[PDB]
Structure 1
Amino acid sequence: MEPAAGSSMEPSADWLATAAARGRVEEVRALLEAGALPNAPNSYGRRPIQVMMMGSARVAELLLLHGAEPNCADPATLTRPVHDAAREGFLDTLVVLHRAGARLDVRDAWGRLPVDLAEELGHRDVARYLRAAAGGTRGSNHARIDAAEGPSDIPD
Protein backbone atom coordinates (compact mmCIF):
# COMPACT_ATOMS: atom_id res chain seq x y z
CA MET A 1 0.00 0.00 0.00
CA GLU A 2 2.99 2.33 0.48
CA PRO A 3 5.09 2.79 -2.67
CA ALA A 4 8.81 3.57 -2.23
CA ALA A 5 11.04 6.06 -4.08
CA GLY A 6 14.39 4.77 -5.41
CA SER A 7 15.86 1.28 -4.77
CA SER A 8 16.71 0.52 -8.42
CA MET A 9 19.94 -0.32 -10.28
CA GLU A 10 19.71 1.71 -13.53
CA PRO A 11 16.03 1.22 -14.43
CA SER A 12 16.71 1.48 -18.19
CA ALA A 13 14.05 -0.41 -20.20
CA ASP A 14 11.13 1.62 -21.62
CA TRP A 15 13.39 4.68 -22.04
CA LEU A 16 14.21 3.45 -25.56
CA ALA A 17 10.74 3.82 -27.14
CA THR A 18 9.96 6.93 -25.05
CA ALA A 19 12.95 8.97 -26.34
CA ALA A 20 12.22 7.75 -29.90
CA ALA A 21 8.67 9.18 -29.74
CA ARG A 22 10.18 12.41 -28.32
CA GLY A 23 12.59 12.97 -31.24
CA ARG A 24 15.62 12.03 -29.12
CA VAL A 25 18.23 10.16 -31.19
CA GLU A 26 21.08 10.75 -28.69
CA GLU A 27 18.92 9.61 -25.75
CA VAL A 28 18.28 6.18 -27.30
CA ARG A 29 21.68 5.83 -29.05
CA ALA A 30 23.17 5.72 -25.55
CA LEU A 31 20.34 3.70 -23.96
CA LEU A 32 19.84 1.34 -26.94
CA GLU A 33 23.59 0.54 -26.85
CA ALA A 34 23.37 0.23 -23.04
CA GLY A 35 20.86 -2.66 -23.21
CA ALA A 36 17.51 -0.95 -24.02
CA LEU A 37 14.83 -3.60 -24.70
CA PRO A 38 13.44 -3.26 -28.25
CA ASN A 39 10.56 -5.70 -27.66
CA ALA A 40 9.68 -4.00 -24.35
CA PRO A 41 5.98 -4.02 -23.44
CA ASN A 42 4.96 -0.50 -24.52
CA SER A 43 1.94 1.10 -22.80
CA TYR A 44 0.38 2.14 -26.15
CA GLY A 45 -0.01 -1.39 -27.59
CA ARG A 46 2.49 -0.09 -30.15
CA ARG A 47 6.09 -0.95 -31.09
CA PRO A 48 9.56 0.34 -30.24
CA ILE A 49 9.70 2.20 -33.59
CA GLN A 50 5.99 2.57 -34.49
CA VAL A 51 6.05 5.21 -31.71
CA MET A 52 9.48 6.71 -32.55
CA MET A 53 9.62 10.14 -34.21
CA MET A 54 8.74 9.19 -37.80
CA GLY A 55 10.46 12.46 -38.81
CA SER A 56 13.89 10.90 -38.14
CA ALA A 57 14.76 7.58 -39.82
CA ARG A 58 17.87 7.84 -37.63
CA VAL A 59 15.84 6.71 -34.57
CA ALA A 60 14.12 3.74 -36.28
CA GLU A 61 17.62 2.69 -37.37
CA LEU A 62 18.74 2.65 -33.72
CA LEU A 63 15.86 0.32 -32.76
CA LEU A 64 16.01 -1.53 -36.12
CA LEU A 65 19.82 -1.92 -36.17
CA HIS A 66 19.34 -3.39 -32.71
CA GLY A 67 16.24 -5.41 -33.67
CA ALA A 68 12.96 -3.50 -33.10
CA GLU A 69 9.56 -4.69 -34.39
CA PRO A 70 9.53 -3.26 -37.92
CA ASN A 71 7.26 -6.19 -38.89
CA CYS A 72 5.13 -7.05 -35.84
CA ALA A 73 2.09 -4.76 -35.38
CA ASP A 74 -1.02 -4.69 -33.15
CA PRO A 75 -3.37 -7.68 -32.88
CA ALA A 76 -6.12 -5.11 -32.10
CA THR A 77 -5.59 -2.45 -34.80
CA LEU A 78 -2.87 -4.23 -36.82
CA THR A 79 -1.33 -0.75 -37.15
CA ARG A 80 1.85 -1.88 -38.93
CA PRO A 81 4.90 0.24 -38.15
CA VAL A 82 5.27 0.59 -41.94
CA HIS A 83 2.47 3.20 -41.92
CA ASP A 84 4.29 5.41 -39.41
CA ALA A 85 6.99 5.97 -42.06
CA ALA A 86 4.72 6.63 -45.09
CA ARG A 87 1.94 8.24 -42.99
CA GLU A 88 4.58 10.74 -41.83
CA GLY A 89 5.85 11.12 -45.42
CA PHE A 90 9.17 9.54 -44.40
CA LEU A 91 10.81 7.24 -46.96
CA ASP A 92 14.22 6.75 -45.28
CA THR A 93 12.27 4.95 -42.53
CA LEU A 94 10.59 2.47 -44.91
CA VAL A 95 13.87 1.49 -46.62
CA VAL A 96 15.37 0.82 -43.18
CA LEU A 97 12.50 -1.54 -42.22
CA HIS A 98 12.91 -3.38 -45.53
CA ARG A 99 16.70 -3.28 -44.98
CA ALA A 100 16.22 -5.33 -41.80
CA GLY A 101 13.38 -7.89 -42.22
CA ALA A 102 10.11 -5.90 -42.19
CA ARG A 103 6.84 -6.81 -43.96
CA LEU A 104 5.43 -3.73 -45.73
CA ASP A 105 2.37 -5.33 -47.38
CA VAL A 106 -0.17 -5.62 -44.55
CA ARG A 107 -3.52 -3.97 -43.77
CA ASP A 108 -4.57 -2.17 -40.57
CA ALA A 109 -7.24 -4.08 -38.58
CA TRP A 110 -9.79 -1.70 -40.15
CA GLY A 111 -9.20 -2.33 -43.87
CA ARG A 112 -6.54 0.12 -45.14
CA LEU A 113 -2.87 -0.21 -46.21
CA PRO A 114 0.49 1.48 -45.54
CA VAL A 115 0.77 2.60 -49.19
CA ASP A 116 -2.84 3.86 -49.41
CA LEU A 117 -2.45 5.99 -46.24
CA ALA A 118 0.35 7.87 -48.02
CA GLU A 119 -1.86 8.41 -51.10
CA GLU A 120 -4.33 10.20 -48.79
CA LEU A 121 -2.00 12.47 -46.76
CA GLY A 122 0.58 13.50 -49.39
CA HIS A 123 3.56 11.11 -49.39
CA ARG A 124 3.22 9.74 -52.96
CA ASP A 125 7.03 9.49 -52.89
CA VAL A 126 6.76 7.22 -49.83
CA ALA A 127 3.66 5.43 -51.17
CA ARG A 128 5.47 4.76 -54.47
CA TYR A 129 8.37 2.74 -53.01
CA LEU A 130 5.63 1.17 -50.85
CA ARG A 131 3.24 -0.02 -53.60
CA ALA A 132 6.34 -1.86 -54.89
CA ALA A 133 7.32 -3.62 -51.63
CA ALA A 134 3.68 -3.69 -50.44
CA GLY A 135 2.43 -6.38 -52.85
CA GLY A 136 3.78 -7.78 -56.14
CA THR A 137 0.64 -6.73 -58.08
CA ARG A 138 1.12 -3.25 -59.61
CA GLY A 139 -1.70 -2.34 -62.04
CA SER A 140 -2.66 1.37 -62.27
CA ASN A 141 -5.76 1.09 -64.50
CA HIS A 142 -6.54 -2.51 -63.52
CA ALA A 143 -8.56 -4.19 -60.75
CA ARG A 144 -8.20 -7.54 -58.93
CA ILE A 145 -11.29 -9.77 -58.61
CA ASP A 146 -14.25 -8.08 -56.84
CA ALA A 147 -13.11 -8.60 -53.22
CA ALA A 148 -13.91 -5.55 -51.04
CA GLU A 149 -11.68 -6.06 -47.98
CA GLY A 150 -13.19 -4.51 -44.83
CA PRO A 151 -16.53 -4.49 -43.00
CA SER A 152 -19.28 -6.81 -44.28
CA ASP A 153 -22.11 -5.24 -46.35
CA ILE A 154 -21.27 -2.56 -48.97
CA PRO A 155 -23.66 0.38 -48.62
CA ASP A 156 -23.33 2.63 -51.70
Structure 2
Amino acid sequence: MEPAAGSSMEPSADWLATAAARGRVEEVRALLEAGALPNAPNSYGRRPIQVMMMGSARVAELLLLHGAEPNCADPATLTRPVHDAAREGFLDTLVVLHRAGARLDVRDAWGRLPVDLAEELGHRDVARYLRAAAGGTRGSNHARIDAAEGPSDIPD
Protein backbone atom coordinates (compact mmCIF):
# COMPACT_ATOMS: atom_id res chain seq x y z
CA MET A 1 0.00 0.00 0.00
CA GLU A 2 1.14 3.63 0.45
CA PRO A 3 3.59 3.97 3.36
CA ALA A 4 3.53 7.19 5.44
CA ALA A 5 4.99 8.48 8.74
CA GLY A 6 5.70 12.25 8.57
CA SER A 7 9.34 13.29 8.01
CA SER A 8 9.61 13.08 4.19
CA MET A 9 12.84 12.51 2.23
CA GLU A 10 13.14 14.67 -0.91
CA PRO A 11 16.46 16.43 -1.52
CA SER A 12 15.29 18.82 -4.27
CA ALA A 13 17.86 21.08 -6.00
CA ASP A 14 19.86 22.85 -3.27
CA TRP A 15 23.51 22.99 -4.46
CA LEU A 16 23.66 26.62 -5.69
CA ALA A 17 22.67 27.68 -2.15
CA THR A 18 24.93 25.25 -0.20
CA ALA A 19 28.00 26.48 -2.14
CA ALA A 20 27.17 30.18 -1.51
CA ALA A 21 26.76 29.76 2.28
CA ARG A 22 30.24 28.18 2.17
CA GLY A 23 31.75 31.40 0.74
CA ARG A 24 32.38 29.27 -2.37
CA VAL A 25 31.68 31.34 -5.49
CA GLU A 26 33.48 28.93 -7.87
CA GLU A 27 31.10 26.03 -7.12
CA VAL A 28 28.10 28.34 -7.72
CA ARG A 29 29.41 30.02 -10.90
CA ALA A 30 29.96 26.57 -12.44
CA LEU A 31 26.63 25.38 -10.97
CA LEU A 32 24.41 28.40 -11.79
CA GLU A 33 25.46 27.93 -15.43
CA ALA A 34 25.29 24.12 -15.16
CA GLY A 35 21.53 24.53 -14.57
CA ALA A 36 21.41 25.34 -10.82
CA LEU A 37 17.80 26.03 -9.76
CA PRO A 38 17.64 29.83 -9.74
CA ASN A 39 14.54 29.69 -7.52
CA ALA A 40 15.25 26.64 -5.34
CA PRO A 41 14.08 27.17 -1.75
CA ASN A 42 16.56 25.54 0.65
CA SER A 43 15.56 23.89 3.95
CA TYR A 44 17.56 26.59 5.81
CA GLY A 45 14.65 29.02 5.32
CA ARG A 46 17.29 31.47 4.06
CA ARG A 47 16.52 31.56 0.30
CA PRO A 48 19.39 30.94 -2.15
CA ILE A 49 21.07 34.31 -1.42
CA GLN A 50 19.98 34.91 2.19
CA VAL A 51 22.18 31.85 2.88
CA MET A 52 25.25 32.87 0.79
CA MET A 53 27.32 33.50 3.94
CA MET A 54 26.56 37.23 3.33
CA GLY A 55 30.36 37.52 3.02
CA SER A 56 30.73 37.10 -0.77
CA ALA A 57 28.44 39.51 -2.70
CA ARG A 58 30.01 38.03 -5.86
CA VAL A 59 27.76 35.03 -5.12
CA ALA A 60 24.59 37.18 -4.85
CA GLU A 61 25.15 38.54 -8.39
CA LEU A 62 25.57 34.92 -9.56
CA LEU A 63 22.12 33.89 -8.30
CA LEU A 64 20.45 37.35 -8.45
CA LEU A 65 21.58 38.09 -12.03
CA HIS A 66 20.40 34.55 -12.71
CA GLY A 67 17.10 34.98 -10.83
CA ALA A 68 17.44 34.18 -7.10
CA GLU A 69 14.94 35.34 -4.47
CA PRO A 70 16.19 38.78 -3.41
CA ASN A 71 12.57 39.57 -2.46
CA CYS A 72 10.77 36.49 -1.06
CA ALA A 73 11.83 35.64 2.49
CA ASP A 74 10.62 33.68 5.54
CA PRO A 75 6.94 33.40 6.44
CA ALA A 76 7.86 33.05 10.14
CA THR A 77 9.82 36.29 10.65
CA LEU A 78 9.84 37.89 7.17
CA THR A 79 13.64 37.55 7.08
CA ARG A 80 14.25 39.10 3.63
CA PRO A 81 17.65 38.92 1.92
CA VAL A 82 18.00 42.62 2.82
CA HIS A 83 18.78 41.88 6.47
CA ASP A 84 21.44 39.33 5.46
CA ALA A 85 23.46 41.98 3.57
CA ALA A 86 23.32 44.64 6.34
CA ARG A 87 23.23 42.09 9.21
CA GLU A 88 26.66 41.00 7.89
CA GLY A 89 27.92 44.48 6.85
CA PHE A 90 28.11 43.57 3.14
CA LEU A 91 26.89 46.53 1.07
CA ASP A 92 28.03 44.93 -2.22
CA THR A 93 25.14 42.48 -1.63
CA LEU A 94 22.44 45.17 -1.21
CA VAL A 95 23.75 46.87 -4.38
CA VAL A 96 23.15 43.64 -6.33
CA LEU A 97 19.68 43.16 -4.78
CA HIS A 98 18.66 46.72 -5.78
CA ARG A 99 20.35 45.98 -9.14
CA ALA A 100 17.66 43.39 -9.89
CA GLY A 101 14.35 44.73 -8.50
CA ALA A 102 14.92 44.19 -4.75
CA ARG A 103 12.14 44.58 -2.17
CA LEU A 104 14.17 46.95 0.07
CA ASP A 105 11.07 47.87 2.12
CA VAL A 106 9.90 44.85 4.13
CA ARG A 107 10.07 44.19 7.87
CA ASP A 108 11.61 41.25 9.74
CA ALA A 109 8.28 40.73 11.57
CA TRP A 110 9.59 42.12 14.91
CA GLY A 111 12.95 43.29 13.50
CA ARG A 112 11.20 46.50 12.30
CA LEU A 113 13.43 46.75 9.21
CA PRO A 114 16.81 45.74 7.77
CA VAL A 115 18.05 49.36 7.81
CA ASP A 116 17.43 49.53 11.57
CA LEU A 117 18.96 46.09 12.25
CA ALA A 118 22.02 47.28 10.29
CA GLU A 119 22.47 50.40 12.47
CA GLU A 120 21.93 48.62 15.82
CA LEU A 121 24.30 45.71 15.02
CA GLY A 122 27.23 47.53 13.36
CA HIS A 123 26.59 48.05 9.63
CA ARG A 124 26.25 51.86 9.54
CA ASP A 125 27.68 51.92 5.99
CA VAL A 126 24.78 49.59 5.15
CA ALA A 127 22.18 51.06 7.56
CA ARG A 128 22.63 54.52 6.02
CA TYR A 129 22.71 53.40 2.36
CA LEU A 130 19.79 51.14 3.30
CA ARG A 131 17.51 54.01 4.41
CA ALA A 132 18.24 55.63 1.03
CA ALA A 133 17.58 52.42 -0.96
CA ALA A 134 14.68 51.25 1.25
CA GLY A 135 13.12 54.71 1.78
CA GLY A 136 10.79 55.33 4.74
CA THR A 137 8.07 57.70 6.08
CA ARG A 138 6.23 56.95 2.81
CA GLY A 139 2.43 57.28 3.02
CA SER A 140 2.47 59.38 6.22
CA ASN A 141 4.15 62.73 5.45
CA HIS A 142 1.84 64.62 7.85
CA ALA A 143 3.20 65.03 11.40
CA ARG A 144 6.48 63.07 11.13
CA ILE A 145 6.97 62.72 14.93
CA ASP A 146 5.87 59.39 16.49
CA ALA A 147 2.16 59.00 17.29
CA ALA A 148 1.23 62.72 17.28
CA GLU A 149 -1.34 63.98 19.81
CA GLY A 150 -4.93 62.95 18.97
CA PRO A 151 -6.67 59.79 17.78
CA SER A 152 -5.93 59.34 14.06
CA ASP A 153 -8.69 57.86 11.86
CA ILE A 154 -8.05 54.54 10.05
CA PRO A 155 -10.83 53.63 7.61
CA ASP A 156 -10.06 50.22 6.03
Q: Is the 8 A contact 1:23 1:52 kept in 2?
A: yes
Q: Is the 8 A contact 2:111 2:117 kept in 1?
A: no
Point out the more displaced range, 92-101 or 134-143.
Answer: 134-143
Point out the more displaced range, 2-11 or 25-34.
Answer: 2-11
| 1:121-146 CA-partner distances (Å, limit 9, x unpaired) | 11111111100111244999997354
Gap regions ≥5 residues in structure 2: none
Which residue of structure 2 lines up, in the alignment, with residue 102 of structure 1?
Answer: 102
Q: Is the 8 A contact 1:110 1:150 kept in 2?
A: no
Gap regions ≥5 residues in structure 1: none
* Shift of residue 39, structure 1, vs aligned partner: 1.4
Q: Is the 8 A contact 2:16 2:36 kept in 1?
A: yes
Equivalent residue pairs, number: 156
Which residue of structure 2 lines up, in the alignment, with residue 76 of structure 1?
Answer: 76
Point out the more displaced range, 102-111 or 54-63.
Answer: 102-111
Label 1:96 to 1:62 Cα distance change in 2 as closer, same or farther (>3 A).
same
Please, what TM-score do these two structures have when normalized by structure 2? 0.80
Q: Give RMSD over aligned pairs.
A: 6.3
Please, what TM-score do these two structures have when normalized by structure 1? 0.80
Which residue of structure 1 lines up, in the alignment, with residue 52 of structure 2?
Answer: 52
Label 1:142 to 1:58 Cα distance change in 2 as closer, same or farther (>3 A).
farther
Moved over 4 A (4+): 1-12, 138-143, 147-156
Label 1:4 to 1:75 Cα distance change in 2 as closer, same or farther (>3 A).
closer
Point out the more displaced range, 18-27 or 35-44.
Answer: 35-44
Point out the more displaced range, 75-84 or 3-12.
Answer: 3-12
Query: Identity, % of aligned pairs?
Result: 100
* Shift of residue 46, structure 1, vs aligned partner: 2.0
Q: Is the 8 A contact 1:132 1:138 kept in 2?
A: no
* Shift of residue 151, structure 1, vs aligned partner: 19
Q: Aligned partners of 2:136, 2:117: CA distance in 1, in Å?
A: 18
* Shift of residue 65, structure 1, vs aligned partner: 0.9
